[PDB]
Symmetry: D3
Subunit: 334 residues, 6 copies
C-alpha cells in the first residue's frame, strides 16, 4: 500500500480511483463499511482503492491540545487500512491545504485533479470545505454526472451508534468488551518494552513487560484487564520461555504516572523478560478497578485472583474465534 503526505505527493499519472474520506480513527465497524464499499467498487472497475484521511486531527487544528484521544496511532490506521484492502492512503494536513477551499474547489482539486476519482464513498456525517458548508448531500449534487457518490448511513447495532466517539467512551469507562464489539476486533496497543520494577521471571509480583504511552493515546480506564500479549516478529533473543508471534494470556494493569499512562503485563504461567522487544497488548475484558496495597501478602493474594479471573475470561474469548488470536498460549491451570 502507498502512503502519501499531501496532494503534491500523489503520482501525477495516477490512472483512476475509488475514494473514501474520513478521519477513520479506530477503523471501527462503521469505517469498515466505507472501506468495503470502496474496495469492491475499485475491484469492479480495475481501479485503485484510496483512503483520504487527516493528520493532525481536524479538531486539533482549531483547538490544539484539546484533540480527541487517538484510538489508534496514525501508523496503525495505515496498517488497518491495508488489512482491509486500501491500495493508497492520502494523508491531508488541514494547516497546509484544503481548509479554506470552497466545497466546489475541494471536490475539483482533491477528487479530480489529484485522485482522478470515478467513485467516492463517504459517511452520512461527512463534511468538507470552508466552515464545513459541504455535506454528504452537497457532494451528491456537485458530483452528479462527474462521479458517482455513495453515502453510507452511520452504523447502528444493538441500540448503539458505532462511532469514534462511542469507542472512546467505552474505553474511558473501562468497558473494553463493548469497545471491542464496536471495533470488530480486540482493542490493542503496541510499543517497546522498557525496564520496570525488578526483573521479569520467577517472581509473580514483577511484570513480565512494562510499557509507556503518551497522553494522546486512547487507553482504557486505570484497572486490571484480561488480554493477550504478543511479541512482534523479531530475531533478537528473548529472555525466558516466551516465543515471538504467539499471543500469551496476560493480566494487564493500566495506570497513570502521578498523564503519561503505563501498561504492565503479567503473563500467565511464563517466566520471561521482554525488555527491548516490541510487544502488542490486546484487551479482552475488565477484571477490576485499581487498588492501593498495604502488604506484600495482600498484593499477591489479589494478583492471584486477577490470574484466576483472567484464565476464565480468556478461555471464553478463545471460543469467540473471529476476535481471538490465531496462535495462542493459555494454560488450563497454574
Amino acid at each position: 500500500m502507498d502512503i502519501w503526505y499531501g496532494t503534491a505527493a500523489v503520482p501525477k499519472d495516477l490512472d483512476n480511483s475509488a475514494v473514501t474520506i474520513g478521519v477513520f480513527d479506530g477503523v471501527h465497524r462503521g469505517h469498515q463499511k466505507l472501506i468495503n464499499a470502496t474496495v469492491e467498487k475499485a475491484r469492479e472497475v480495475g481501479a485503485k482503492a484510496i483512503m483520504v484521511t487527516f493528520d493532525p486531527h481536524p479538531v486539533s487544528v482549531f483547538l490544539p491540545r484539546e484533540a480527541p484521544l487517538g484510538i489508534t496511532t496514525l501508523a496503525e490506521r495505515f496498517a488497518l487500512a491495508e488489512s482491509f484492502g486500501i491500495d493508497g492512503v492520502l494523508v491531508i494536513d488541514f494547516t497546509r491545504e484544503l481548509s479554506g477551499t470552497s466545497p466546489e474547489k475541494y471536490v475539483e482539486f482533491l477528487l479530480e485533479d489529484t485522485l482522478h476519482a470515478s467513485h467516492v464513498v463517504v459517511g452520512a456525517n461527512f463534511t468538507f470545505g470552508e466552515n464545513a458548508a459541504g455535506t454528504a448531500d452537497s457532494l451528491r449534487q456537485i458530483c452528479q454526472s462527474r462521479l458517482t457518490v455513495d453515502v453510507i448511513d452511520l452504523l447502528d447495532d444493538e441500540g448503539v451508534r458505532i462511532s469514534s466517539t462511542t469507542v472512546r467512551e467505552f474505553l474511558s469507562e473501562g468497558d473494553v468488551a463493548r469497545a471491542n464489539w464496536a471495533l470488530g476486533r480486540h482493542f490493542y496497543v503496541t510499543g517497546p518494552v522498557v525496564r520496570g520494577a525488578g526483573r521479569g521471571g520467577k517472581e509473580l509480583g514483577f511484570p513480565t513487560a512494562n510499557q509507556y504511552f503518551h497522553d494522546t493515546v486512547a487507553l482504557p480506564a486505570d484497572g486490571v484487564y484480561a488480554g493477550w500479549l504478543t511479541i512482534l516478529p523479531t530475531e533478537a533473543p528473548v529472555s525466558g520461555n516466551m516465543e515471538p508471534e504467539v499471543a500469551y494470556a496476560a493480566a494487564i494493569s493500566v495506570g497513570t504516572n502521578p498523564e503519561q499512562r503505563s501498561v504492565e503485563s503479567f503473563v500467565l504461567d511464563r517466566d520471561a523478560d521482554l525488555y527491548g522487544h516490541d510487544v502488542k497488548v490486546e484487551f479482552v475484558d475488565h477484571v477490576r478497578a485499581m487498588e492501593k496495597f498495604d502488604s506484600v501478602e495482600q498484593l499477591l493474594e489479589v494478583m492471584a485472583k486477577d490470574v484466576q479471573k483472567t484464565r476464565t475470561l480468556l478461555a471464553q474469548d478463545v471460543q469467540a474465534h473471529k476476535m481471538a488470536p490465531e496462535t495462542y498460549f493459555l494454560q488450563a491451570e497454574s
Copy 2:
C-alpha cells in the same frame, strides 16, 4: 492623579486632605460609596481626596500564595480610583510599614504626619493596627476633636452583601451578570494579544484574539460568555476590519491550560487578527459550560449557537446603557 508608594514618598508639604482607606479590590459599588463621600468632602474644603490602599494584599502577608484572587490588577485599581475622582493614591506595603504599629501610632503617623487629614471615611468592616485591634469605632474615639470620621455601612442590595468576597464568588460560579450588578459596570480584563490557533480572519473556528492571564487574576469560570472586545487606543496597524476604541460584540471562551488561564475571543461578523495589540474584554453574560468536541462539524455547529445567543444577550445589554459601551459594533444578524 498622583501615585505614591509608601509614606516616605508623600510630599512633605501636602497641605490638607480627605482620606479613605481599604484594599478596594474591584472598586465595587460599596467602594464607590466611600470614594464618593470622600471626594465630596474634599471638594467642600478645597482639599485633596486621597485613597490609602494596600499592595500586596494584606492577607498574602500572613498567608503567601493563598492570597485572594485579584478582581482588578493594581493598575486598574489606580485607573478606577481616578475615574471616580481620587487625586492621590497612597499604596501601603504591610511588610515595610504600619503592620506592627498600635492603633494610636497608626492614626498619628498615617493620617496626620503623612496625609494631614481633616476628614477620613472608612467602611464598617475596616480594621487597623497590630493584630487588628483597631476598629471603625476605635477610629471614631481616637479621632474625636482631631479629625472627623464617617463610617459607611456595608452595602446591601437585593438581599446580597456587596463585597470583594461576593464579587469573587459570582465570578467563580460564572455568574458575571450578578458580578457586574455588584461592580456597577461590566467585569473586564485587559491584556496583550498573542498568536493562537491559526490566524484570525475568514475562518470562524479561529479566535480573533488570544490572551493569557496569571493565576492571581480573578476570572469567571471556564465557559463561554457574551461580551465586548475593545482595542485600546493605538497607532499600530490593525490586521482586518476592526477599528480601535470601538467595543465589538464577541463570544468569549475562558479556559485553563492543563492554573494559567486563557481568554479566546470570537468577534462577531469581523475578520481580524489582533496580535500585538492591547485589548479589553468586558463580560456581560454566561452562555454555556465548556464542552469537549469530537468533530470539526460539531465544534462549528456549537460555535454558531454561541454567536446566536451572544447576539441576543448583547442586544439586551445595549438597552441597559449605564453598563453598555459608548461606541459599539453589533450586527442585527450574520
Copy 3:
C-alpha cells in the same frame, strides 16, 4: 542499640538471640506486643532482643512510588524500637536478599546462620519467602525442635483492628485522637525549622515555626490541630521566650503546597522564632478543616478561636498523662 544493614553486617560471633520480624511502621500497640514478648524472652535466657525490619517497604519493591505512607521515618522506627528495649535492629533490603529464597532457606539463613535465634516472635499476619508461601503456621512447623515460635494474634480493641493500615486511615481522615489511641502515644513528626511568612514573635498571624515534609511521610489531613511543640536538645541560641526540651502548647496547621506537605505551628502565648532548630510536633486533636481567608480581620478572628479550642483540648490531654508530655507549657488563658 546496634543497627545493621543487611545480613552480612551482623557480627559473626553473635552469641544467641530472641527475634521479632516485621515492617513495624508506626510501632503501634500491636507492634509493642511483639516487642514486649521478645524483650521478655531475651531477658529470661540472657540473650539479645533483635528486630528484623524492612527498608524500603516490601510493597514498594513490586510497586515503586505506590508505597504506603511512612507513619514513622526509618530513623524513628529505630528510636522507638530502642525505647521499647530492642538491642539490635537488622534492616533487610528485599532487592538485595531474602526475596527469592524458599521458606526453608529463609529460616535457615536469617534465623540460624545470621542471628543464632533460640526464640522467634511474629504476628499472625506474618509472611516470608518466594511469593509469600511461608505463613506463621509454616514457621511453627519448620522450626519445631530447632527453635521456639510464638505467634501473637493481631490486636483488637474497641472493635478496631490495630494495624499500620488503620493508623494510616485515621491520619488520612484527620482523626489523630483515634490514631494516637492505636499508637499508644501522640502521633508526631520531627524536622528542621525553616523561614516562612514574616518572622516569629509579636505578631499572632506569623507562625512560630514552619516545616516541610516529603510526600512519603504520613501526615494528618490538611486542617488545624491542637498539639505540642518541643525544641529538641540543643546548645544553639533560641530567638524568643521558648526553652529547649519543653513541650509548648500549639495550634498546628497542616497544608499542601499546590504533594509536599507543610506544618506551621502557632505556639500559644509565646514570642519566638525557631529557624534552624530541630522541632518535634506532636498531634493531639483535630480542631477544624482548612479555610480560605478574604480579610486579615477574618483570618485573625479564626486564628483566635483555634487558640481557644486548642487550650481546651490540651488542658484535657494533660489529664491523660500516659500520653501527655513530661514537661509542658500551657497557660490557663491569654
Copy 4:
C-alpha cells in the same frame, strides 16, 4: 496600512501593485532601499506599495527552535513598514503555502494572480521556489513585458555589509552603536513594565522599570547601556515625575536568567518613578560596561553612579549628533 495573512486574505479587488519580497528582519538600511524604491514607484503609477514578508522565519520551517533571533518582533516589522509608507503587508507562512511550488508557479500565483503586480523590487540575495531554485536572474527572465524587475545590491557602507546577520552580530557583541548605524535608528524593544526589586522612588538602586523578553528577541549582550526610555501614549496615571511620549535619559541593565528569559532594567536619570503596568519603549545608544558581581551595597552604588555619569556624556553626544536622537527628550547635565 493593511496586513494580510496568506494569499487568500488579499482582496480580489486589488488591481495594481508594486511589490517587495523579503524577511525584512530589523528593517535596516539595506531594507530601506527596497522599500523606498517600491514606495516611490507605487506613487508614480496609481498603485499600492506591498511588502511580502514571512512568518514563521523561513529558516525555522526547516530548523525549528534553531531560528535566528528576531531583531524586531513581527508587530514592529509591520509598524516599521508603515512608517516607510508601505500600503499592505502580505504575510506568507511557508508551512501553509508557496513552499512546494516551482519558480514558475510561485511568480504567477503570488505576483500575478494574487497581487496583480506591475513592478517588483528585491535584494540581490533573493531566493524563491522549491529548494531555492529561483534567483534574482531567474526572476527577471520569467517576468518579461508584464513586470519591471528592479534588483538592488546589498548595502555596503564604510566597508561593512549591512544585513540582518550583521545587525545580529553587532547586537550580540554588545556594539549597539554599530547596530544603530546599520539600522538607521536606535535599536529598541517595547514591552509592559512589571514589578521587580523594591519600588521606584527616591532610592537609586531600585530600577524605574523592569521588563522581561522571550529568548526569541535579539537583545544586546548582558551589560549596562546608555539609552532612552519612553512611556507609550496612555491615559493611565504615572507614579512619579515622568510623562508619556518623552524620551528620558536612562542607564539600562541587560541581564539573563535560567528561566531562557532576558531582563531589561532601566534606571532613569534624575526621576523618582515607578512604571509598573505601562508599555515602555527602550532605545539603546551606547555600551557602557560588561556585567559584574557585587558583594557590598556601597560598591554597587559606587558603580551605579559611574554608569550614570557615563550615560550623561554618551547621551549628550547622541543629542548633539542629532540624526538619531528623539524629538522630545529629558536629560540633565548635572545631578
Copy 5:
C-alpha cells in the same frame, strides 16, 4: 541464546560451560578475542559458551548518574553476543548479589555452583570480589585442576589500545572512523522514528527520519556524518520509495537539546520517504562537518547539498573498502 537475570535464573540443569566475564560494552575487537576463545573452546568440549555481564554498570553502583555512556544498549549487547555465538548471557546486578562476596566465595558460587564451569576466559584487566581484591593472577591460583583459566592481554593494534574507554573517546571527538576500526564494524544506534519538521517528501531539507535518544546512549559529537540507514524487518507499509532490509546512503545530523536528549536526523540520498513509526538502524561511517547556525534558507540548502556530495564520496570508499559495508545497499553516484 538464553538470557538469565541473576544466578537464581540459571538452569540447575547446566552441567558444563566455558565462561567469559566482563562489562563488554560495545563488544569491540578486544571483546571479540574473549568471546572467540570462549566459543571455540565450548565447541571443543561438549559445553555451552556463557557470557557473564553486568547491568547496571558496575561504576554506576558506586557513582549513580556518573555512569559511562553506553556504547551499545544492554539489548544490543545481547544481540552482539548471540552473533558471535554465545549460548547463554548471565546478567549480574551488583546491587543484588556477588558484591559483598570475597574472591574465594565469588569463584565457587558463580563459576562452580551456578555455572559448573570447566573453562574461564577473561581480560588481563579483569577485577572481582570485594573492593577489587581478585585479579587475573588471583583467579588462576584459586582454580587449579578444575578450571582452565585463559587470560588474554588487552588488544593493542596500530599503537592504539582498543577498550570501551578508547571507543567512547573516539565517539566523543566525532571520530567514528576510528571508533569503527576499534569496534570491527560501523557504530550504530537503533530506534523508532518519530515526527519532526514537515513531512518526508520531495523537499531536501525535511529529514527522512527523526530519532531521539536518552543521555545514557553514547553518540558521536554533534555534527554531520556519512552513514547508512536501514528499516528493520517489518510488514508495516513504508511511505515513499524505500524498502526494509536495505541499507540506504544517508547524511546524518546529530544534535542536542536542553530537554538531556540527543537527536539523530537522517537525510537519505535520492529518496522521497517518511519513515514515521518504523524501527531504523543508523550506521555511522565518517565525520563530514561540525555543527553550524544558519540565517538564510539558501545557505542551509547550499550546505545541505555539500553534505550530500561529501557523503557520496565517503560512502563510495566504504563500499570499496568492502570489509565494513552492508550486504544489500542503495547508493547513487550522481544526483
Copy 6:
C-alpha cells in the same frame, strides 16, 4: 545570647549597650577584631555586647538572586557570635526598616532610641543610611559626647586582606587551607544526613554520609578534601562504630548536580557506619584533588585508596599544627 528580629523586638528595658554593626558573613578574623573590641568594652562598663547584623543580605535587597554565597548560614552566624561572647544579636531586614532613613535618623533610631548605646565598633569600610551616604567619619562626628566610636581598619596579614570576599575567593578556588587561615578555624557545613548510594558498611566506595545544600551555601570547589566529620550531640542510635561528639578523619567529596544543588559525601577512614538521619558537621582541612570521571570500578577504588593515604598525611599535619585541630578526634596512621 538573645536574637531580635527588627528594632521593635528589642526590649524597651535595655538601658546600656556596646554595639557592633556589619553583615559578619563568615565571622572571620577581621570580624573577630570587631567583636573582641565590643565584648571587652561591654564587660568594662556594666553593659551588654550587641551585634547588629543583616538578613537578607543587603546586596540581595537590590540584586535579588544575585546575592553573595553565604560563608555561614544565618544560624551559624548566631552561634559564632555567641561563641565570641555577644549578648544580643539584632537582625535588620532592609526591606522592612532603616533603608529609606538619612544618616541622622539612622543613628538616633538604631543606636540611641532602640539600643541606648554608649559605645560603637565598626570596620573602616562601614557604610549606612540612604544611598551609602554615611561612612566611618560621618559616624564619628554625629555621635559626639554620647558615643565612643572605635573604627578598626580591615585586617591585613601576610600581605592578604581578610574579608568575606577574600574567604569566598579561597573557597571557590578550592583553597580551604587559606580560607581557614582567614577564618581562624576550619570552614564547615552542618546538615542532616540522607540516603545515597548503597549502605554504609564494609564497602569503601559507599559514603559514610550524604548531604545536600542549596546553591545559597558557599562550598569549596568540586573535588576531594581532607576533613573531620562530627555527629552532633544526639541520643539517637548510630549504625556502626562511631560516636557522637568525636571528630573522625574523613575524605570528603564535593560535587554538583543539575537539580542548583551541591552534594557533600564523606568517606570516614577505618569505620563501618551509616549516618542516615543524624546531624553532622563537616570540617574542611586541605584540598586533595580535582574531580574526575571513572570508567572501571578498580580505577575508582585505586584512586579512593590514594585519597585516603593523602587524607591521613594532611590530617596528621593538622593535628600536629595543633591550633585548628578538634578537641576529641579519631585518626589512625595505618589502615
